[PDB]
Amino acid sequence: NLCPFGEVFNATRFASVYAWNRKRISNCVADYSVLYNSASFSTFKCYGVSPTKLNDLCFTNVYADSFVIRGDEVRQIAPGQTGKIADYNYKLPDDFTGCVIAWNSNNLDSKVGGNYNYLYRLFRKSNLKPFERDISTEIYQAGSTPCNGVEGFNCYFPLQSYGFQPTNGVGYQPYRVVVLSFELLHAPATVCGP
């Protein structure tokens, strides 16, 4: 009764980072060692837990969050990070228990002339809390004058497009990211290794 991690890692399309997706993993058996040992994952960094011990543990729920950012931003998907992505799009807590997995997806997510489907949030009144998700498109008030819902002077639509294009340098190429978080509750632990 295997955990359906394939639906996460092998999805055709990933979400924009500002609208990141989450899959709840429960009541199943998962072989984390198979993922951790795959060379196709160039980032596979765990926090508060050892990747090689994951097959020895049970959790009540496992959460798999997935999205696309560009290469230079993968470093922001870590505890303690700041920047547009960490501050405004996807935020890990200081005391994160889980793993960050990423791989270059230029062959999947770029297109000649640009793939404009993947967006990022550039402005926000405050930083996201850990695991908070903000998909609003209210006009951002950059200055002293209220915006009243209309773009204008110091009044910005909050999102931009990556426009991923295949000859971008690697720091501007798309990377698919999967964040696994391991949750232990009073409820029974239903997600175990082999």
Partner: nanobody, 115 residues
Framework: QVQLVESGGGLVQAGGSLRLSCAAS????????MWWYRQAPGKEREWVAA????????RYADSVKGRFTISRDNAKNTVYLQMNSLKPEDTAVYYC????????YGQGTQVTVSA
């Protein structure tokens, strides 16, 4: 409402220079990422250069690095592509792209380099 109108192309001799113009209407150019592409007959569209929204950070394809420069004239609501040291293989139609909810495209301007 929104449109991108290009100008400044034309015929120029190898080693010379041109300044392409991408004039926007319906949004401020400083608020949005902009990309420049080019296409030569029988070849695919080729990314050339880009400038980020709300800032001055730029990037360039290896083929034009050091010779092409993006800049903005916010008073004119215009983004320029300065092209120096032109070679015959720079001949192509040049386009500017801007995403504003969806992608808008300049009409293109022909650059032909002679030797």
């Amino acid at each position: 409402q929104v449109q991108l109108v290009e100008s400044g192309g034309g015929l120029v001799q190898a080693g010379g220079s041109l300044r392409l113009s991408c004039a926007a209407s319906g949004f401020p150019v400083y608020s949005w990422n902009m990309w420049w592409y080019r296409q030569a007959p029988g070849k695919e569209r080729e990314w050339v250069a880009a400038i980020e929204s709300h800032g001055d950070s730029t990037r360039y394809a290896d083929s034009v690095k050091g010779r092409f420069t993006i800049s903005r004239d916010n008073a004119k609501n215009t983004v320029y592509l300065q092209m120096n040291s032109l070679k015959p293989e720079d001949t192509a139609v040049y386009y500017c792209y801007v995403w504003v909810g969806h992608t808008y495209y300049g009409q293109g301007t022909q650059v032909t380099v002679s030797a």
